[PDB]
C-alpha cells in the first residue's frame with residue numbers, strides 16, 4: 074500500500090502495536106559473540122543492545138578492537154551510517170578514535186546528557202574554547218572552535234587532532250536538544266528541519282566517511298533519523314515514489330543493527346516524518 078493512506082488505515086484501526094510486533098518477529102537474528110566476551114562488559118551500556126559481529130565497527134588496535142557501534146550500509150539509497158551508543162566514561166577515547174579512523178565529518182546526537190534525572194551519556198566534548206580535552210588512552214586532542222545555539226538544536230565546530238601525527242580535522246557536532254523525556258514529538262517539523270541541516274553540511278555525503286549517530290542505546294531515536302533519511306532519498310531516486318515501503322526499509326536496516334525503532338510510537342512518528350518530508354521536498 075502507499076504510505077499516507079496505510080497510515081490513516083492504521084490510525085483508524087488502532088493497530089500500531091500489532092504492526093510493530095510483526096516487525097519484531099520478522100527481524101534478523103545474527104551472532105554478537107564479540108560484544109558478549111567478559112573483557113567487554115564495561116564497554117556496553119545495556120546488556121540487551123549489542124552490535125552484530127558481521128557489521129560491527131573495529132577499532133584499529135591490537136589489544137582490544139571492540140566498540141558498541143554498527144555500520145548500516147544502504148545499497149540502493151547509496152548512503153551509510155554508523156549507529157552507536159552514547160559514550161561511557163571508559164569509552165570516550167574509543168568513540169573519538171572511531172570518528173578519526175572512519176574519516177567521519179559529522180556526529181549526530183539525539184539525547185541530552187541528563188534525562189529523567191539520570192545520566193544518558195558522558196560529557197564527551199568540551200564546553201569552553203579555552204578548556205580543551207585530551208584522551209590519553211587513544212592519543213587525541215579535542216577543541217571547541219565555535220557553537221551556535223538555536224531553539225531546537227545546537228551546532229558545534231570541533232577540531233580533532235591526532236597527537237601521534239599532528240594531523241588535524243574539522244568535525245561538525247549536530248545536537249538535537251528538544252526530544253521529550255517521554256514519548257515522541259507532537260510534530261515532525263523541527264526534526265525534519267534538523268535532518269536537512271545535517272544534509273546541507275555535507276556530513277552525509279560520499280566524499281566523507283559515514284556519519285556517526287547516537288542517542289542513549291543507539292537504536293531508538295537513532296533508528297528514526299536514518300530510517301527517515303533513507304526513505305526520503307529513495308522517494309527522490311525512484312520513478313514511482315509511492316513504491317517506497319517503510320516497513321521493508323526498516324527490516325533491511327535491522328540486518329545491520331538489532332532493535333532499530335524501540336516502540337510503536339517511534340514507528341508512527343517515523344511514518345509521520347517521511348510523509349511530511351515528502352511534501353516539502355517538492
Ligand SMILES: COc1ccc(C2=NCCc3sccc32)cc1
Pocket residue numbers: 114115116117118119161162163
Ligand atoms: C571500569 O570502568 C568503567 C567505567 C564506567 C562504567 C559505566 N558507568 C556508567 C554506567 C555504565 S553501563 C556500563 C558501564 C557503565 C563501567 C566501567
